């Protein structure tokens, strides 16, 4: 009656970003995963819906301060509803997502979600206090979020997997695959400007030599809550001349080698070749 109006208020900021183009690597991963596990279409639908809400809510919490517009006539959610409403809808949406998950123990599910916020905590902490994460810390952070969200999807699918697949023989390789895939996806994605960092930027800072100019723009942007368009150009130009993108390409090639090995290992564990998964891996390049 009047409660439908209240719900419409509560979910208005969510419905806003939920209409944006997703560029669904995650759903393509779940589809590829299900070519092995063969979970009923009805179930993977709910699992997709669950992790999407989880992913969308992550974005709302991430971009609740963002002022830059999303599309042509679509401002940031913050520029429609303000920070407070955005944050409140986001927190509610996560809890609703967890409630939806509880249909497919309790403490285990809660812990899996909470790891995501452990990851975000480190990312936020480092950003706010001006720490450039080492490559090792960068990876651990990715594992606790982008990799973790991927892991949640994998676990839910394994739980609802067809009765003719051996879950215990496969759970091992499946999560090693998931962790490496999320890392590969995140590294690839952070590369597609040149997240807040990149493998190139991180390596350049920590590897060798003085780039006083670079240290100082980052501090400048940090003081201003981000860098301008010119400053970003400047940082890209430094990275391009130091040949630091070549390091990223080296790591990714090795990452594909590790991942192609994991897939074949699983393809042999089951009697199922997975071109879809190998296809997805091949499209996460350079």
Interface with its own copies: number of residues (CB under 8 A): 72
Has 72 been labeled as part of a binding site?
Answer: yes
What residues between 215 and 244 interact with its own copies by CB under 8 A?
215-217, 219-220, 222-223, 228, 230-231, 233-234, 236-237
| Per-residue interface string for the shown chain with its own copies, residues 175-214, x marking contact by CB under 8 A | -----------------------------------x-xx-
User: Can you tell me whether residue 134 is helix, strand or coil?
Assistant: coil
Quote the least distance from Cβ 58 to its own copies, whole Å.
10
**What is the distance between the alpha carbons of residues 278 and 33, in angstroms, rounded to a whole number?**
11
Q: Which is nearer to its own copies, 122 or 277 (CB)?
A: 122
23 has binding-site annotation = yes
Q: Which two tokens stand for residue 153?
A: 């999807």
Should residue 135 be labelled a site residue for its own copies when binding is judged by CB under 8 A?
no
Q: Tell me the closest approach of the beta carbon of residue 201 to its own copies, in angstroms.
A: 15
First to last CA, the chain: 53
CA–CA dist 277, 35 (Å, integer): 9
Asked if residue 203 lies in contact with residue 133, where contact means CB atoms within 8 angstroms, the answer is no
Site for its own copies in 53-112 (CB under 8 A): 61-62, 64-65, 69, 72-75, 79-85, 87-92, 94-96, 98-99, 102-103, 106-107, 110-111
**Choice between 141 and 284, CB closer to its own copies:** 141
Radius of gyration of the chain (CA): 20
**C-alpha torsion angle, residues 149, 155, 157, 161 (rounded to 10):** 170
Distance CA(276)–CA(279), nearest Å, equals 5
Q: What is the spatial distance between Cα 232 and Cα 237, in angstroms, rounded to a whole number?
A: 9
Q: Does 134 bind its own copies (CB under 8 A)?
A: no
User: Which of 117, 139, 270, 273 forms a contact with its own copies (CB under 8 A)?
Assistant: 117
167 annotated as belonging to a binding site for a ligand: no
Task: Find the shortest distance in angstroms from Cβ 246 to its own copies.
Answer: 20
- CA triplet 107, 111, 116: central angle to 5 degrees? 160
Binding residue numbers for isopentenyl diphosphate: 23, 26, 55, 72
């Amino acid at each position: 009656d009047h409660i439908f109006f209240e719900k419409a208020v509560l979910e208005a900021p969510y419905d806003y970003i939920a209409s944006m183009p997703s560029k669904g690597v995650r759903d393509q991963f779940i589809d590829a995963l299900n070519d092995w596990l063969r979970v009923p279409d009805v179930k993977v639908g709910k699992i997709k819906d669950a992790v999407r809400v989880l992913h969308n809510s992550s974005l709302l919490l991430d971009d609740f301060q963002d002022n830059s517009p999303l599309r042509r006539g679509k401002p940031s959610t913050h520029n429609i509803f303000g920070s407070a409403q955005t944050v409140n809808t986001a927190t509610y949406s996560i809890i609703k997502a967890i409630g939806q998950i509880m249909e497919f123990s309790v403490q285990e599910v809660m812990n899996s979600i909470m790891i995501l916020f452990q990851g975000q905590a480190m990312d936020l902490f480092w950003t706010y206090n001006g720490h450039v994460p080492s490559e090792e810390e960068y990876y651990r952070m990715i594992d606790q979020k982008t990799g973790q969200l991927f892991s949640i999807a994998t676990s839910l699918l394994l739980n609802a997997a067809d009765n003719e697949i051996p879950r215990t023989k496969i759970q091992s390789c499946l999560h090693r695959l998931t962790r490496l895939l999320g890392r590969c996806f995140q590294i690839r994605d952070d590369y597609q400007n040149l997240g807040k960092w990149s493998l190139a930027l991180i390596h350049m800072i920590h590897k060798q030599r003085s780039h006083m100019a670079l240290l100082n723009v980052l501090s400048t942007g940090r003081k201003h809550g981000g860098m301008t368009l010119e400053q970003k150009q400047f940082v890209l130009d430094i990275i391009e001349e130091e040949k630091s993108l070549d390091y990223t390409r080296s790591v990714m090639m090795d990452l594909h080698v590790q991942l192609r090995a994991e897939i074949g290992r699983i393809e042999i564990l089951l009697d199922s070749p997975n071109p879809a998964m190998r296809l997805l891996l091949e499209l996460l390049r350079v």
